[PDB]
Design a protein around this ligand. Structure first.
Ligand SMILES: Nc1ncnc2c1ncn2[C@@H]1O[C@H](COP(=O)(O)OP(=O)(O)OP(=O)(O)O)[C@@H](O)[C@H]1O
Ligand SMILES: Nc1ncnc2c1ncn2[C@@H]1O[C@H](COP(=O)(O)OP(=O)(O)OP(=O)(O)O)[C@@H](O)[C@H]1O
Lengths: 606, 159, 166
DNA sequence: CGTTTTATTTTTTTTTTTAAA
């Protein structure tokens, strides 16, 4: 019973209880509770192997394992948590010697991850010094601001060059520093000392549980000295932390103080390869069903013109560059972009929403709701002295992500013409009176293009329909059609399938097996240690067939190709080689181009 | 710009310098600064430095010979074969954009744009001038911006 | 998350019968497709029609409460509360509808195509005719989406149309 | 056992926005 006067907490209890818990530890998930799971030693001892042998410091660790153990530890950790957490670090810093006594025991650890929240909208006096974790989407990308910890002194006679660190804010003054004979008066200087880093960026909560017609309400907090630009800013992320408060300087004439207290959260943590299962990796490549099988997975319920799931073939087994290590010239980036054209309310958002609901780099857009110039970080008025900064653009924070765009022929001429270069150049020359540079960003594009009309007018080859010329309307490889089959035949099918999606009350695990995650990992392996080349085999095809590509150009109101889409073809070459097991070029791949292209390119009848 | 990250921008940082280092700086150059980071006694951060390392002594294709100056153009002995043999022009049509093909008129014409103009000795009543106004058009999908981008590597202040 | 109410007037004129739909109207299809129901309201000269409506109006002019002795009036409170008991049924649409309704939908798509100067259709036409019926069972309060549940759906859909030529 | 406290206004350039036969 040795305790702060105003509390009920003690070091030894929690220390011993947790050291027994980690001795009551074999991975209690994978060796006590999930015995059907298995990695059989206390994982933290295992880590003191797989940390020390890894030599890879600053562990990360939760504490939700502790529900089985005595919950009083849970509580007094919940409520008094800046005064027990170092004790659990001390237990770890003791565990060092369980597995290596005579190590280089000079480094420390970093570190929760267990408790709940619902939302930020409304909290209470009770919820003042307690553990919380909440999530949303990030807004900003800050700079650093350090923070002091100690005073380094000076002297006048005989070098009374004293020193001393800070509790948090005071140094004392008798007539000299650490009163040493007072040959002179007190001394201080403030630089040769200890400093500490941080930042500040805020979050926008973005769940599906956002109350009705309500605005953004948003939160923010600093960092600590290792938690500092962990962060490609702006995405769906959770934090843990400890609700903090602070009084405020009333007015500013003098030391008066406010009644109201501002709040933020303490600064801790954030939230986001296997040799074991090699078998199926090769198993799926050598299976010719890649054309459709995973494509069959993507739309979970929808066949909606499943030649578009073969258009989803276009898209993943990840996308190789022909970067230019030999000559160094020209920066030939292997970019990819296609659209999903309109004139019928088809799934030209729903797929884009399926994607954004899945990929974290998640944004949805369209004409007339926002500006073309949302790469600005506007200085309408700032918390500065008009040191006008355009901190970070918005539409470009999708680093190899996606922004979904809808209703594309919606905006003015300046909009959507301004982007005639970034597509295959990823440069944004900031040549304004303010600060200047040539920046970099490149990513993926998809939208729901629309002509001047609702329905494609018949009798009338496609180059006439959209109001772009036969250079810009005929630009890409193919910008793909979306029609109604003119009959009831197709119509009733997905009705009959998915009329009862309410009423099915089940899902069928067919031979087109709904891969829970066995899909999601192979693609992550899909780019690592084989490297698609291009030798002498699969290139002469449209070397020669450029005859066939362009000699349809003799014609107005018909259309041939132009020499950026051949680039799009050599970029098509990259994907299929490794998977199906020749990382050197095979010839069939160009057929996929003809399988794609002349589906609406030699549909040039007149 | 030799260092350039994804996502992030060439953020700004601020600095002072001494008398002999002062007003000896011009547009976009590559110098070697000193890493003496220092505090603001407001705090916020700053930094400081004391040393920089940004054609009489000669350019590449040389070793030391004599000229109007020390080695300003000294290496006539090796230049001059490539000075007068007027088919050298074809090197300047061929041996300069070998990775590229278009018309052969631009690739025989740009050079004097890069090179000095008139710079004569006449009036105060009015200036005479050397360089010329210039253009290039066509339509895209014809490789009409490779070249401009390359100049930034080729030539100075090819912004 | 807002339900949307669109109400407008015809173009130059009052539904000039020569100037047809989107001939007399100037609205892009993109918004009509987003709208479940489009409704034109015109009532030409009817000798008997405006009478009843007149005396009906004047009733609350000589008086303050219009409808006597045909129903028990429902106050704002009682109306809202009775509606308050409705929406949480999530009713049952038995499986025979799924095959049946997909057939009935085709009945539309044929008589849409048999005239060539007619309306286009979105998947929301079928999604809508689906969407409406199960709602009304909330006010049936029996979890029993059945035949009448969609026969009124189609009935009211048909009444939405086939009203301007005759 | 005495002798002292405390205020700022108009113009720029960007990104927004808005006008007539
Ligand atoms: N075969 C199909 N399977 C599933 N859904 C379909 C199919 N055909 C059409 N749909 C539906 O039709 C809707 C089309 O409208 P959406 O809101 O995407 O329109 P849009 O593409 O923005 O329209 P537009 O591009 O013409 O403005 C989608 O929500 C989708 O659910
Ligand atoms: N004579 C040539 N030499 C080299 N490349 C060529 C030649 N003719 C055509 N090409 C190729 O054709 C492609 C044309 O598309 P490109 O990327 O040049 O658009 P762009 O000219 O940059 O458009 P803009 O100049 O309007 O920005 C080029 O990438 C280029 O490599």
């Amino acid at each position: 019973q040795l305790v702060v006067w105003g509390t009920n907490v003690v070091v030894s209890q929690c220390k011993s209880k947790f050291k027994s818990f980690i001795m009551r530890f074999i991975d209690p998930s994978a060796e006590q509770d999930e015995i059907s799971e298995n990695i059989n030693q206390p994982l933290y001892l295992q880590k003191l192997e797989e940390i020390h042998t890894l030599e890879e410091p600053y562990l990360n660790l939760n504490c939700a394992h502790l529900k089985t153990f005595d919950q009083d530890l849970y509580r007094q950790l919940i409520c008094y948590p800046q005064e027990v957490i170092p004790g659990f670090d001390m237990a770890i810093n003791e565990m060092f010697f369980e597995r290596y006594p005579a190590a280089l025991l000079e480094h420390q650890i970093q570190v929760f991850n267990a408790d709940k929240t619902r939302n930020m909208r409304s909290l209470n006096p009770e919820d003042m010094d307690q553990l919380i974790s909440i999530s949303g989407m990030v807004i900003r990308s800050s700079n650093v601001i350090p923070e002091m910890r100690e005073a380094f002194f000076s002297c006048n006679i005989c070098s009374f060059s004293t020193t001393v660190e800070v509790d948090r804010g005071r140094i004392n003054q008798p007539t000299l520093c650490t009163n040493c004979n007072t040959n002179h008066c007190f001394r201080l200087i403030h630089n040769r000392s200890e400093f500490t880093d941080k930042q500040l960026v805020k979050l926008q909560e973005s769940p599906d549980d956002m109350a009705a017609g309500q605005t953004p309400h948003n939160v923010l907090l600093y960092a600590h000295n290792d938690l500092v630009d962990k962060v490609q800013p702006g995405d769906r992320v959770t934090v843990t932390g400890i609700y903090r408060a602070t009084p405020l300087k009333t007015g500013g004439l003098s030391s008066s103080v406010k009644s109201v207290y501002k709040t933020h959260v303490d600064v801790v943590h954030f939230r986001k390869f296997p040799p074991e299962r090699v078998e199926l990796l090769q198993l799926l490549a050598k299976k010719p069903d890649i054309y459709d099988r995973l494509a069959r997975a993507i739309a979970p319920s929808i066949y909606e013109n499943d030649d578009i799931k073969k258009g989803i073939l276009l898209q993943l087994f990840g996308g190789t560059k022909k970067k230019h290590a030999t000559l160094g010239r020209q920066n030939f980036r292997s970019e990819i972009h296609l659209l999903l054209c309109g004139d019928p309310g088809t799934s030209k958002s729903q797929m884009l929403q399926y994607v954004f609901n899945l990929v974290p780099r998640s944004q949805y857009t369209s004409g007339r709701g926002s500006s073309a110039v949302g790469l600005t970080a506007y200085v309408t008025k700032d918390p500065e002295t008009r040191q006008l900064v355009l901190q970070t653009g918005a539409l470009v924070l999708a680093d190899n992500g996606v922004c979904c765009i809808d209703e594309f022929d919606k905006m003015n001429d300046s909009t959507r013409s301004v982007l005639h270069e970034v597509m295959e150049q990823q440069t944004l020359s900031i040549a304004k009176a303010g600060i200047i540079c040539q920046l970099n960003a490149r990513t993926s594009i998809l939208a729901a293009a629309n002509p001047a009309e609702s329905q494609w007018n018949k009798r009338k080859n496609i180059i006439d329909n959209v109001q772009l010329p036969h250079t810009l309307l005929s630009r890409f490889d193919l910008i793909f059609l979306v029609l109604d089959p003119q009959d009831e035949i197709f119509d009733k099918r997905l009705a009959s399938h998915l009329v009862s999606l309410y009423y099915v009350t089940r899902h069928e695990e067919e031979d087109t097996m709904f891969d829970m995650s066995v899909l999601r990992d192979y693609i992550a392996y899909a780019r690592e240690h084989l490297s698609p080349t291009l030798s002498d085999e699969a290139q002469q095809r449209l070397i020669q067939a450029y005859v066939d590509m362009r000699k349809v150009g003799a014609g107005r109101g018909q259309i041939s190709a132009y020499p950026r889409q051949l680039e799009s073809l050599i970029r098509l070459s990259e994907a299929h080689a490794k998977v199906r097991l020749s990382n050197q070029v095979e010839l069939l791949d160009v057929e996929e181009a003809w399988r794609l292209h002349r589906e609406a390119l030699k549909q040039s009848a007149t | 710009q030799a260092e350039l990250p994804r996502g992030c921008i060439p953020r700004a940082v601020e600095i002072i310098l001494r008398s002999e280092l002062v007003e000896t700086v011009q547009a976009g150059d590559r110098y070697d600064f000193t890493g003496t980071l220092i505090v603001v006694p407001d705090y916020r951060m700053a930094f400081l430095a004391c040393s920089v390392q940004a054609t009489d002594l000669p350019m590449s294709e040389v070793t030391a010979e004599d000229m109007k100056k020390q080695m300003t153009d000294a290496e006539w002995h090796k230049i001059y074969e490539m000075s007068k043999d007027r088919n050298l022009y074809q090197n300047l049509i061929s041996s300069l954009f070998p990775s590229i093909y278009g018309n052969d008129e631009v690739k025989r014409g740009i050079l004097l744009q890069q090179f000095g103009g008139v710079a004569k000795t006449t009036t105060e009543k009015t200036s005479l001038r050397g360089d010329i106004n210039v253009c290039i058009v066509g339509d895209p999908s014809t490789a009409k911006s490779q070249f401009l981008k390359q100049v930034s590597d080729f030539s100075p202040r090819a912004i | 998350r807002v339900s949307i109410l669109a109400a407008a007037n015809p173009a130059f004129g009052r539904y000039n019968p020569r100037r047809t739909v989107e001939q007399n109207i100037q609205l892009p299809a993109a918004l009509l497709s987003r709208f479940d129901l489009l409704w034109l309201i015109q009532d030409k000269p009817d000798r008997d029609n405006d009478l009843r409506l007149a005396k009906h109006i004047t009733y609350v002019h000589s008086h303050s409460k219009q409808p006597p002795t045909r129903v028990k009036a429902l106050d704002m409170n009682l109306m809202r509360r009775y509606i308050n008991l409705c929406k949480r049924k999530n009713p049952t649409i038995p499986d025979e509808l799924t095959d049946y309704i997909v057939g009935a939908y085709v009945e539309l798509r044929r008589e849409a195509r048999n005239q060539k100067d007619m309306t286009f259709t979105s998947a929301r036409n079928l999604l809508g005719i689906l969407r409406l019926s199960t709602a009304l069972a909330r006010l049936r309060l029996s979890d029993s989406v059945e035949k009448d549940d969609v026969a009124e759906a189609l009935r009211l859909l048909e009444m939405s149309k086939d009203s301007l030529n005759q």
